[PDB]
Design an enzyme around this catalytic site. Sequence first.
Site, PDB file in Angstrom:
ATOM      1  N   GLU A   2      -9.304   7.213   2.409  1.00 31.14           N
ATOM      2  CA  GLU A   2      -9.147   8.380   1.546  1.00 31.14           C
ATOM      3  C   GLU A   2     -10.375   8.508   0.658  1.00 31.14           C
ATOM      4  OE1 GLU A   2      -5.532   8.214  -0.659  1.00 31.14           O
ATOM      5  OE2 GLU A   2      -4.333   7.462   1.019  1.00 31.14           O
ATOM      6  N   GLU A  43      -0.783   1.426   0.752  1.00 28.81           N
ATOM      7  CA  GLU A  43      -0.551   1.022  -0.636  1.00 28.81           C
ATOM      8  C   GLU A  43       0.697   0.151  -0.774  1.00 28.81           C
ATOM      9  OE1 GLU A  43      -1.165   5.240  -2.233  1.00 28.81           O
ATOM     10  OE2 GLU A  43      -2.275   4.027  -3.683  1.00 28.81           O
TER      11      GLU A  43
END
Lengths: 408, 204
Positions: free
Chosen positions: B127, B51
């Site tokens: 994820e 991220e």
Amino acid sequence: GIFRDVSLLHKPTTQISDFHVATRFNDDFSRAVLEAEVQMCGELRDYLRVTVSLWQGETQVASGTAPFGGEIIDERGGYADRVTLRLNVENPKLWSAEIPNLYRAVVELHTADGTLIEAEACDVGFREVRIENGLLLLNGKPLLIRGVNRHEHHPLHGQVMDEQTMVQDILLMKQNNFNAVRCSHYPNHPLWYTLCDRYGLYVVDEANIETHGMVPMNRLTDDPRWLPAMSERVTRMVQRDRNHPSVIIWSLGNESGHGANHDALYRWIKSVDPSRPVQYEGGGADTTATDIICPMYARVDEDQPFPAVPKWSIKKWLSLPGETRPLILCEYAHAMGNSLGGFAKYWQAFRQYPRLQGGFVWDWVDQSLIKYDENGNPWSAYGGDFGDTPNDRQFCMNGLVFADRTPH
Amino acid sequence: DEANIETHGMVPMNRLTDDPRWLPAMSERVTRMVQRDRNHPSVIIWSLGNESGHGANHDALYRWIKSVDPSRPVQYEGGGADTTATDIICPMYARVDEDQPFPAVPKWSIKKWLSLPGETRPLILCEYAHAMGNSLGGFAKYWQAFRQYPRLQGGFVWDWVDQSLIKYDENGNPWSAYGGDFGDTPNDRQFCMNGLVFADRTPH
Ligand code: NA
Ligand code: NA
Ligand code: NA
Ligand code: NA
């Protein structure tokens, strides 16, 4: 029987024997080049000329004149009996099923002084068809095929077609949000392509080759001894119909397995007419003989893993390792009787996945025939009603409309 | 094996990762990890971090890894999970059938993602199936898709163990604590507990 028209044609000894029309465009389609190749038979004379003029209604848009004699193509020279004329068109009106803009091209064979020997003409639609990055594009935009398969069938006249029935079918199709038709499974009556040019419908032109009953299905199509017969059926169709703007895709036939003859004829078409993709379903619908994954009755989500010719779910088919082509079902949503359950699932998938670009419903009109009982009262008949045996009963009626063109 | 680079709080997320002045610091975190762990057989994939958007530093370090250790694929999720800096489409919380078309970083449904024009890479969710509390509804849908599609090769559940900490009340009795229980402010309360097992490793 003799189920299409018979006519006599008178030509002069020196005559136009073939002409091809091709359109090329720039990146934004604002400039087009109309390339016309004209071929002649008879005695060549130095005074012979060919003039090609392009008309938009009553106004002449472009023109060109040249003597015979083509460019050098190999060591021995060029074609002395051919000429190619290139006409520039600025801001051409493009052809599509939404707006079927048409021009009129006139091909004149005449002497240098100005006397006309012969004239030929055809409607011209400016449009580009190509597959780029896995998407079928028309004039730079990805198509969504709202298609249907259509047999040439009339409940009274059998397989004899007329202009009135053709127009009725085209109007009904367009009124029900169809934009494409598959000529299942053969070249149609010549007026059909003219009407599709005029009204606006994308057409898949299909060769008259189906060997479904053979065991295995490719017993003939993999045999070089049948290659001449197959080649005639492909090449003569292309030679007849290559000028029609409505024809956007060629098909090599239907349900004939996959043999080397299919690959040979696929390549022949790609060489002679690069302007149209080639598709073929046989052999599992994703062989080397098709530019489009075109399965028949592949389901939206459910896999059907048959041996050696599986029908994967269409969503899964797109993502198979190494697969990049678009997917357009050549037949789906079998409309036999009270049917078309699950149609919305197909169209949800078509709208969600870019490379799912639609399909062709099977099919347009029931193949029922009319019989009369003991009181002259007509009734619709299907397989077995004529003493025919063995037969396949009511499997001839798979249409969205009845044989008299009333809707289901 | 994942590099210690996450700049999630930046606005935009790639403000640092697209700045050449931070390339040395990012490069140290990638290169020293590779130098430390490249001999371990269990490590099969390198990750450039988490991220941090997509910047030119990501592309540079992706290529550095590809040059020094060709034996392992390189993956990175930032910038929409299918950038030039990843060998694997590795989205986070992309859904099985439902598209989530966010501006400039859409989360397509994983089945649709595989078939986008010109896309050929495998898809492995870095994820998915966020296990926060009473959760993991719809897990079977993911695994049906994984088994049906060859290029859907699985994913990594988020996550293993709750990040709860132990505090004692007025009687020495322990109790599990989450964000805000230590006077920390601002905090993100119970979002630290996303595990399949409790902090003491008893299963959910
Ligand atoms: Na689509
Ligand atoms: Na039938
Ligand atoms: Na899989
Ligand atoms: Na969390």
